[PDB]
């Protein structure tokens, strides 16, 4: 049946997948030895005597994040051949990952991806979990995605990026390789759901009351996001949304496909029993400006299309009532070429909770993924940031060293300059 | 794999590196005979970075103990943790460098460089791939700077794509033993500025007084200076040998700090550091530990950053900590010290999270900081150079072994180039 | 007592018992990573791998009884 091959690159993608593959194991109950003490055939492949194996290929040019998951608790679940590892790290550098150190690993990664894409009937999408903030995530991510474009042309290729957040930036060369990776994100990707660190920083303090979370707590939120997105494929419910129609209701033009996300019932169990999480309450908490997991005020730019993934015990009629609540609100603006602007899905099993996590039990959640014109100033803020270092050409000798003919910075300059220029061209 | 070949340059680098192999051995739980304990297999799981299997269960350091006089080689093997090195790793010079750049770089460098390059060739080519070579040395002495940086020239021309990481000490402003200081420091900089990828400096007078007013220790010897540098010795390479949340490499440290390939001379600092009476009375968390590490009071390089600008900074945190109060504090210290950092670089600094702390601590940092405040030594050793250079003095001890007037005005013009690059980038 | 009350400042308190250093009590009993901090329960890290009772050629567990 259906399957979605997940490809994680970079330590951010690996640690995100350590939480996503964590949570898929407990949704349809599957123990770390593969065994269960037809719904598992969306992220697992049964082989032998109950040995369910995930559909993932780990990727990093350094042996530190993936050797550590070999010795962890998933030595047996993650079968030890698709955990592809290298030796020299790409070192926050696009000219390393997309070039000299990295062709040795694209060859073996494409082999195991081809084995995983031709062992189950009718593959449905490629969920890539990359990190445009550094080395192996952006460099090997760009080279690998450029080879999947010709190897599978008709293919849906959802991404999940960690764009450099405005004030938080843990590496100084993030503005270069973020602009340099827009060439891999503008014409080689169908769905470009946008995440960044400091918005999931704020989403946990004021809602889950942890003033010092960690990247584990961040990746639990991202795991909730993609679990709701792929809940309709895996599970059953009224008015399903497939990956095939996911981008059909969010991508108006072939170039503008950069979406956002918001969850909704992100409450620790203390102040979760004290509020009645109604359909209208969670969808307006979803459309709240502070609930975006990106620095994007969704009020300087008009919305174009929404994709509201309801799941749990929700009736398909009060969803229409709460959507009508959002439509009449003047704080949630729309643009004039969409009298309808919602495609909503509904699952039936509740949004799961991880035992030992920061969330609680709710049988409802709105993981709305929206394509708005307000994603443009996320990119345009990086435009002013990129120009201030490129003016007198610092941190460039490395790029010019291992590749990067001087002019790839200029074509990535105009590629991202043409990117937001489309955005205010669309919405007038 | 991921291995770093270590070089014990000079006797100054010998005493510094002896306590370096002290801190790495007990961080990896290593018996001085060569074996292991420590209840945590994570120490063995990355042991190849600094060690080799001795085909008997023993582990030996990948160090090259090198000098032109065997008196200090006797003291290293007589001291604790001295039997770890195999005897073939030591190389001996007999006549002794006379605190003299010509005596090391030219005359008896010819009879020892052919030996030490054989030892480092049998060490570096024992693996399929490596990152680079770290060197502990001095710029005050002749065998620590002359034939020390002479090895830097040869190792670069055979390894042109491998990282160089030079732990180096500098002459002091207020005190100067071994009277010919600037003629040793300057002529080694002329090769250390292009044959070394990452140079990072130590002042033993800055280590004398860090032991004074932040550690509160009454009588400072040199052995307490060695271990204090030795904490930041381990902290810069700790993320290679240990897993972490933000894994970092010395190539990460290179790619993220130096803007322009000429200027790579960085500052090194360590935290936490308190006296016996002040150990109990201080908090231990990120937002309190960063205020100490962003001080001139604890900086092991005595170039006052308040009259300079941080072109780039970096803090490799260690220990199991949350990371939001790490990097929100990184922008917090940048917003508060807005003029102290450079303006054309938004979010100047790196933050790294390593997962294993140094033993006996919940957390610690090392601070690699590219600062233009370091130019105050590069004008101090330049106008002290031209003091003796104008009066032609103490230089007949050099010309008789291969000098000329050309390379001395070239050496002066090299710091005149590097200082002018520093001040023009403000 | 064994000197914890007055803010014990030395971790030499755990080195009298491993005086021969090999007695299998100081041999590999903890792992200190954030992955065990976050994603780890009772015993699913230290478990052996079952391959076959028939050797290297045995790709599974089988026999003439089946």
């Amino acid at each position: 049946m259906r399957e979605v091959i997940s490809i994680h690159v970079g330590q951010a993608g690996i640690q995100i997948g350590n939480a996503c593959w964590e949570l898929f194991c407990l949704e349809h109950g599957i123990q770390p030895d593969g065994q269960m003490p037809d719904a598992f055939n969306t992220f697992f492949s049964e082989t032998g005597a109950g040995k369910h194996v995930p559909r993932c290929v780990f990727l990093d040019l350094e042996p530190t994040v993936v050797d550590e998951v070999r010795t962890g608790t998933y030595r047996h679940l993650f079968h030890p051949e698709q955990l592809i590892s290298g030796k020299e790290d790409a070192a926050n550098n696009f000219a390393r990952g997309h070039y000299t150190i990295g062709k040795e690993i694209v060859d073996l990664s494409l082999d195991r991806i081809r084995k995983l894409a031709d062992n189950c009937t009718g593959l449905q999408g490629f969920l890539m979990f990359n990190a445009v903030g550094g080395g192996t995530g952006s460099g090997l991510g760009c080279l690998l995605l450029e080879r999947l474009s010709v190897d599978y042309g008709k293919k849906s290729k959802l991404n999940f990026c960690s764009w450099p957040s405005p004030q938080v930036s843990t590496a100084v060369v993030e503005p270069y390789n973020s602009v340099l990776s827009t060439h891999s994100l503008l014409e080689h990707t169908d769905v470009a759901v946008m995440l960044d660190n400091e918005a999931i920083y704020d989403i946990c303090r004021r809602n889950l009351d942890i003033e010092r979370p960690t990247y584990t707590n961040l990746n639990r939120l991202i795991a909730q996001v993609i679990s709701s997105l792929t809940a309709s494929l895996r599970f059953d419910g009224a008015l399903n949304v497939d990956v095939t129609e996911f981008q059909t209701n969010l991508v108006p033009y072939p170039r503008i496909h950069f979406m956002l996300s918001s969850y909704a019932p992100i409450i620790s169990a203390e102040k979760a029993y004290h509020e009645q999480l109604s359909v209208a309450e969670i969808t307006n908490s979803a459309f709240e400006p502070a609930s975006m997991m990106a620095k994007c005020d969704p009020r300087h730019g008009k919305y174009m299309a929404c994709c509201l993934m309801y799941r749990g015990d929700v009736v398909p009629k009060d969803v229409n009532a709460a959507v009508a609540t959002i439509k009449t609100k003047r704080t949630i603006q729309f643009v004039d070429w969409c009298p309808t602007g919602f495609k909503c899905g509904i699952n039936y099993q509740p949004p799961t909770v991880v035992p030992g996590g920061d969330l609680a039990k709710v049988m409802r959640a709105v993981c709305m993924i929206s394509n708005s014109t307000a994603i443009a100033e996320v990119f345009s803020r990086m435009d002013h940031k990129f120009d201030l270092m490129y003016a007198k050409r610092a941190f460039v000798h490395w790029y010019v060293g291992e590749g990067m003919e001087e002019g790839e910075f200029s074509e990535a300059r105009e590629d991202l300059a043409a990117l937001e220029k489309d955005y205010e061209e669309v919405g007038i | 794999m991921r291995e770093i070949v270590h070089v014990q340059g000079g006797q100054c680098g010998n005493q510094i590196g002896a306590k370096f192999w002290e801190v790495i051995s007990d961080e990896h739980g290593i018996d001085p005979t060569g074996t292991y304990c420590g209840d945590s297999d994570l120490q063995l799981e990355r042991i190849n970075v600094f060690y080799n299997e001795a085909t008997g269960g023993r582990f030996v350091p990948r160090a090259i103990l090198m000098d032109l006089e065997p008196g200090t080689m006797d003291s290293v093997r007589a001291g604790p943790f001295g039997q770890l090195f195999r005897p073939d790793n030591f190389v001996f010079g007999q006549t002794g460098a006379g605190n003299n750049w010509a005596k090391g770089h030219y005359t008896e460098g010819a009879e020892l460089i052919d030996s030490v390059l054989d030892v480092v060739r049998k060490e570096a080519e024992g693996c399929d791939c490596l990152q680079g070579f770290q060197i502990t040395h001095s710029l005050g002495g002749g065998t620590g700077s002359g034939m020390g940086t002479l090895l830097i020239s040869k190792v670069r021309e055979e390894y042109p794509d491998r990282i160089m990481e030079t732990f180096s000490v500098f002459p002091s402003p207020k005190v100067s033993d071994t009277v010919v200081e600037p003629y040793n420091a300057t002529l080694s900089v002329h090769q250390l500025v292009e044959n070394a990828d990452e140079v990072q400096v130590i002042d033993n007078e800055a280590l004398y007084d860090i032991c004074f007013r932040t550690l509160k220790l009454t009588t400072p010897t040199y052995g307490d200076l060695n271990h204090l540098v030795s904490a930041a010795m381990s902290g810069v390479t700790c993320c290679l040998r240990f897993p972490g949340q933000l894994n970092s490499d010395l190539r990460k440290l290179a790619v993220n700090l130096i803007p322009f390939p000429r200027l790579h001379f960085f500052l090194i600092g360590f935290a936490p550091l308190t006296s016996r009476g002040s150990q109990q009375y201080r908090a231990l968390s990120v937002p309190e530990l960063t205020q100490q590490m962003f001080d001139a009071k604890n900086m092991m390089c005595a170039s006052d950053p308040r009259h300079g600008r941080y072109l780039t900074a970096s803090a490799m945190f260690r220990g199991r900590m949350s990371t939001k109060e790490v990097d929100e504090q990184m922008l917090n210290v940048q917003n508060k010290n807005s003029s102290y950092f450079v303006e054309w670089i938004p979010n100047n600094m790196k933050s790294s999270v390593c997962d294993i702390p140094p033993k006996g601590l919940k957390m610690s940092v090392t601070f690699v900081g590219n600062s233009t405040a370091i130019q105050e030594m590069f004008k101090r050793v330049s106008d002290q150079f031209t003091a003796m250079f104008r009066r032609k003095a103490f230089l007949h001890w050099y010309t008789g072994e291969g000098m000329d007037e050309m390379e001395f005005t070239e050496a002066e013009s090299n710091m005149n180039d590097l200082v002018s690059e520093y001040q023009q980038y403000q | 007592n064994d000197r914890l009350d007055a803010h014990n400042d030395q971790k030499l308190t755990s080195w009298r018992i491993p005086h021969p250093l090999y007695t299998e009590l100081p041999q590999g009993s903890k792992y200190e990573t954030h992955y065990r901090q976050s994603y780890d329960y009772e015993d699913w890290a230290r478990r052996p791998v079952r391959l076959s009772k028939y050797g290297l050629l045995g790709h599974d567990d089988s026999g003439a009884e089946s």
Binding site: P63, D67, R70, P80 | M1, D41, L44, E45, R46, I47, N48, N52, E53, G57, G126, C127, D128 | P48, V49, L51, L56
Partner: peptide, 22 residues
């Protein structure tokens, strides 16, 4: 070529753990 014990991440160590313990 340098060969260490089976408890070190070096070359194929997952195939060097089960047949011979070290």
């Amino acid at each position: 070529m340098a060969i260490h014990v089976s408890r070190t991440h070096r070359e194929d160590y997952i195939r060097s753990l089960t047949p011979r313990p070290a």
